[PDB]
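Input sequence (129 aa), recorded before submission:
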Amino acid sequence: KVFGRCELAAAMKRHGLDNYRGYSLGNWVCAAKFESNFNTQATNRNTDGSTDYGILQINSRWWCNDGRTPGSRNLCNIPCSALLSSDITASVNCAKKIVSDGNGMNAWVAWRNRCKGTDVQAWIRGCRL
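Predicted structure, token format:
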């Protein structure tokens, strides 16, 4: 599924992401924009052999099981394929764990490089929420 901007904002709010760990909804939408361009099916291989999955590009090195990342952990206790669903519940639940791990949203390199410190409210501008 490719979400619209406000559509994703609404879905994220519905699943309790808005202001989760103090990160406003615009931060989460911005992260999704630059991680996946709002595409729930996005997958990207990392040089080290792990893979990033879904709307928030969650990494099999730590967070989900894909059966092909030697050494890795599955701290969200989910198959990585669950992070590709049209329904964002699994990705949201896992993102909540990631953002609570100590470094906040810096876990998402694209968030740090492209969203952090910017006018993130623009991402929810005009949205009926």
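Checked by second reader. The chain is about 30% helix and 5% strand.
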